[PDB]
Amino acid sequence: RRKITQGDDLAPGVLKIVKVYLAVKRRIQPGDKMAGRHGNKGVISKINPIED
Amino acid sequence: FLKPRLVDIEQVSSTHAKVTLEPLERGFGHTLGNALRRILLSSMPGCAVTEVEIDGVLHEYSTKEGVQEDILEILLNLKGLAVRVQGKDEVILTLNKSGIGPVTAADITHDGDVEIVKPQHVICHLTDENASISMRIKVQRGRGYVPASTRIRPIGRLLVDACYSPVERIAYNVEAARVEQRTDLDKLVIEMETNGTIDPEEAIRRAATILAEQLEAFVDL
Amino acid sequence: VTEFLKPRLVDIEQVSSTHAKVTLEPLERGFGHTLGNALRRILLSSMPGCAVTEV
């Protein structure tokens, strides 16, 4: 607890640094690079509808 | 000219049923099968969760004590949840189960308008007797696929992508009809692999309507 | 939930009395092909005509 309580050593001349972590759910987008294990690399040309 | 009928609607299983359209002429049957399959796969009314508020977690990318799966895992399980509602468009369902044992759709509080097609479906696993889970899942009807980002308040409410499509796999088979009075007639048998929320005959009739009103545009005023 | 954009025939250009190019601006996602495929087969193989070539 004391290790958390003591102010962490910081780069000189900085009073405080706040590390904000941003988390995003990136999905399949046209142009995303998808490849198989055999090396057939390709981009996603179009998000085709299921019925098509 | 002849007009088809749903002479037979057999429920071979709860998930998927086969629908037969016997009085179909040559060529008409294949066209109707393809058009019905496309219109069913594309746009059918359906019920799926769209917002979940776990009481104890702030964001989806976090864990809750006593729950084996992640909160995001809970949302992924809840996304493919078999729900039918009749009456009001949107309904909030409350889940509160305590103690050991995996929670199921049956654990959700039962309301009059909404009945779960698949109670045996598993949401998450409660691995602590002391721990408990409370949530409010909001289910509304929609069409096609709606990403979570496209939709839209407090930090507690979690947005989950909505997949309103009740039909998962659809195939139509065109074979010669058994009528003897007039040959070359071919019956159409359509099998719809569905989540179970949609009625087969009702889904076929609704798709036929949607095609008709979309087709009514072509004829002149 | 049953309300879908209803196509309106914005233009029915006739290059010739024989050739026309009807277009509908709205329709629905993945519906233009469905209506188009259905229409193509029905006129192509099921629209009746009175030309018996065999003589």
Q: List, in sequence order, the alpha helices (H) in B171-220.
A: 200-216
Q: Would you call B42 helix, strand, or coil by DSSP?
A: helix
- CB B96, CB B80: distance < 8 Å: no
C30 contacts in A (CB within 8 Å)? 49, 51-52
Residue B98 belongs to what domain range? 45-163
Per-position DSSP letters for B100-159, written without gaps between them: SEEEEGGGBPP-SSEEES-TT-EEEEE--SS-EEEEEEEEEEE-SEE-TTT----SS-EE
Contact state of B42 with A49 under an 8 Å Cβ cutoff: yes
* Contacts of C53 by beta carbon, 8 Å cutoff, 6+ apart: none
Q: Which residues of C touch A (CB under 8 A)?
A: 29-30, 33-34
CB atoms within 10 A of CB B63: 13
- Nearest CA distance, B65 vs chain A (angstrom): 21
Asked if the C-beta of A49 comes within 8 angstroms of chain B's C-beta atoms, the answer is yes
B218 contacts in C (CB within 8 Å)? 9, 35, 39
Q: Which of B219, B169, B162 is nearest to B191 (CA)?
A: B169
| Nearest-angstrom CA–CA distance, A29 and A43 | 9
What residue ranges in A1-52 does DSSP mark as E strands? 33-35, 41-43
- CB B125, CB B148: distance < 8 Å: no
Q: Which residues of A touch C (CB under 8 A)?
A: 49, 51-52
Q: Which of B194, B192, B161 is nearest to B46 (CA)?
A: B194
| Nearest-angstrom CA–CA distance, B122 and B61 | 20
Optimal mutation site among C2, C12, C42, interface B, most CBs of chain B within 10 A: C2
- CB A30, CB A21: distance < 8 Å: no
Enter the tokens of residue A45: 């040309």
Q: Residue B86 — φ and ψ, nearest 5°? A: -130, 140
- CB B40, CB B199: distance < 8 Å: no
- CB B123, CB B103: distance < 8 Å: yes
| Nearest-angstrom CA–CA distance, B178 and B194 | 28
| Nearest-angstrom CA–CA distance, B183 and C8 | 39
Nearest CA in chain A to C29: A49
Enter the tokens of residue A1: 């607890």
Chain C from 23 to 52: CB within 8 A of any B CB: 24, 27-31, 33-35, 37-39, 41-42, 45-46
* Contacts of B98 by beta carbon, 8 Å cutoff, 6+ apart: B126, B129, B131, B132, B133
| Nearest-angstrom CA–CA distance, B40 and B207 | 6
Q: Residue B200 — φ and ψ, nearest 5°? A: -60, -55
| Nearest-angstrom CA–CA distance, B140 and B126 | 27
A50 contacts in B (CB within 8 Å)? 41-42
Chain A from 8 to 47: CB within 8 A of any B CB: 23, 25, 27
| Nearest-angstrom CA–CA distance, C37 and C30 | 11
Nearest CA in chain C to A51: C30
CB atoms within 10 A of CB C40: 11
Who among B41, B61, B148 is closest to A51 (CB)? B41
The structure's method of determination equals: cryo-EM
Enter the tokens of residue B102: 């995996």
A51 contacts in B (CB within 8 Å)? 37-38, 41-42
- Buried b / exposed e over B183-213, threshold 16 CB at 10 Å, is eebbbbbbbbebbbbbbbeebbebbbebbee
- Buried b / exposed e over B81-120, threshold 16 CB at 10 Å, is bbbbbeeeeebebebebbeeeebbbebbeeeeebebbbee
Which CATH number do you get for residue B49?
2.170.120.12
